[model samples]
Target: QESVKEFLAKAKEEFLKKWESPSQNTAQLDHFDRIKTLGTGSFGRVMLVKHKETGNHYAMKILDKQKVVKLKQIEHTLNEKRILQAVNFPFLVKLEFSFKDNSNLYMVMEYVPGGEMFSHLRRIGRFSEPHARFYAAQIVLTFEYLHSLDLIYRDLKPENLLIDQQGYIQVTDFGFAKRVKGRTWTLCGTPEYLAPEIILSKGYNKAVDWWALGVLIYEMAAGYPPFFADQPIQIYEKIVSGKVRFPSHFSSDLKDLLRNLLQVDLTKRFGNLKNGVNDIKNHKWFATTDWIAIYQRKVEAPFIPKFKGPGDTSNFDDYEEEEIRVSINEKCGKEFTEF
Candidate 1:
């Protein structure tokens, strides 16, 4: 509909957005030293890296460019990079720099050495009232902050919460986190935590996060998700049908609180109410909480992770770094240059 010059200019703008920031990161592989693999996923692996110059440590996620294109993950790959660049908070993992090579894409992030919250949850099992309140308040603070910025954290799970050295959580994954004005029909998120609108192909706003928050709180109490099945389709069906039956062990107040949070209508959910997060915070379960203290990070974590120091990998599982990158020869085509 527009001029060819305008189209080319737009294309170049997008390319530069991905390729170079205001300050180009010239950090290459040799500039840092790789220690061990922190974890590995379908696209790539996260490695613990140390800078040669300042001896500073960072977590670097390396994505094989060939695999990224082959698996049709180019969009998600770039989405994570752009989102991480925008987010800067103590509770969120900070992105230090990003760069790419002929063969791989690189993202450098702040290294929180206390390891994953998953380790502690699985070991310690479901939490008690006091502990659950402590952890849940932090999640509330995080979700409120993200919504204030008009961003949605599509994926919210225990595994994604990395415990920091100071006994607080630092969010690790933000690939699906996005800033939006209104509604989006993106069908994504873990099966157990995905909202109903996402399952029904209905457009939704950031309110979907409160739905996931309900699931997270239940998991914290029950040591399992409310909706679970061998297949995700079965899970989706249960989610749409509103099939949650509270266990007898849960107090009436606790059950009532979660039920309101899991309200099928997006805005009707506790966090999405007229008063916003205040309605959720005012709920009986969280009524005793010192929200300001929690936000200021004055509240103590129920379980403080034991660690030797900053480089402690005791809480994380070992992944073979050899499975990292297969030496390959593929032309760095101009089409995928922006990635």
Candidate 2:
């Protein structure tokens, strides 16, 4: 049987080749009809769009050039575009095309209309152990595929994860993601999920992502992080202190996996150990996981989103309309030419 990884790799070549000879009509903003504002972010807004010709839906990420440069995120913005174009996985968002005008950069991507995991998680309060594993199991494969590409998903919270109508997870928002061969010294990521090594300002490798996954799993099962505080400083302190108070409801198997993943010692961390990712995969907590079935998306998702259709926006939050008057200053205008 053909593995999902090989199948996706073969599909990716064709997926990417479609962009090589872009038709004149598909190469610009006019190609898409702006449907509605899906959500807003610090840099710009994501709009639900439909291709006028193909009638296909897409989530167009519109970044204001002025805002991007003002926020000093030009490099990261470019890095995101590069990474998005390079990556094509079942659990990762695919960038179909990108274009730019004088004032903004546009990234046309597949619309995952099922909405953010954060919203769903909040409504449910927390997940049952099996339900949590169902979600976490997808993330496990996501991280594994990303690690194979030497990419570290520096951000891995529920907010950056989206569930499809089919209930599988799709990791989005690559702003903080980076490709690293050796240890990277960047001190980035959510304070609550920060590993001890990251808090200590030590150069770290992909193991930090495993730590974030542990925090994600714990949060899914417990409604909140094991270490929470009023301030980031306090959170960092708690994280570095390496204390994780698990709820009594947590099983020993779950706690056992979390301990290894959240280990302060990088050498002892589950994904960093001699067995690497296999150690985490073979853990007692995931003993029942069907790895191949999960990757192949053969297993039914524990929770599927209630969406009307591919263009449905009911699952997403409403945002106020903003005036599109951000002018691109000449300095930053030149910087976005590559988009």
**Top candidate by TM-score:** 2
Model 1 local distance difference test score: 0.78
Candidate 1 regions exceeding 4 Å error are 1-26, 323-339
Tell me, what's the RMSD of every candidate?
Answer: 7.4, 3.3
Which pairs in model 1 have colliding backbones? none
Error of 1 at 193 (Å): 0.9
Q: Locate the minimum summed-lDDT window of 10 residues in model 2.
A: 18-27
Candidate 2 ranges with C-alpha deviation above 4 Å: 1-26, 326-331
Please provide, for model 2 over 1-339, each residue's C-alpha lDDT reduced to its tens digit, 9 standing for 90 to 100: 256568646655653463343322136887878788888988898888899999999998888887888888887777677777777678998888887776777788889988999999999999999999999888888887777677788898998898997899988888878867879987777888889999898999999999999999999999998889999998988888877899999999999999998899988898987777889889999999998888889998889999989999998888886755435444365786665
Q: Write the per-residue lDDT of candidate 1 for residues 108-223, one digit (tens) a residue.
A: 88888888877777888887777777878888877776676667889898888888877888888876777677887777789999888899899898888899989988888878
Error of 1 at 231 (Å): 1.4
Clashing residue pairs, backbone N/CA/C < 3 A, model 2: none
lDDT of each model, Cα atoms only? Answer: 0.78, 0.84
Q: Which ten residues in a row have the lowest lDDT in candidate 1?
A: 15-24
Which TM-score value belongs to model 2? 0.90
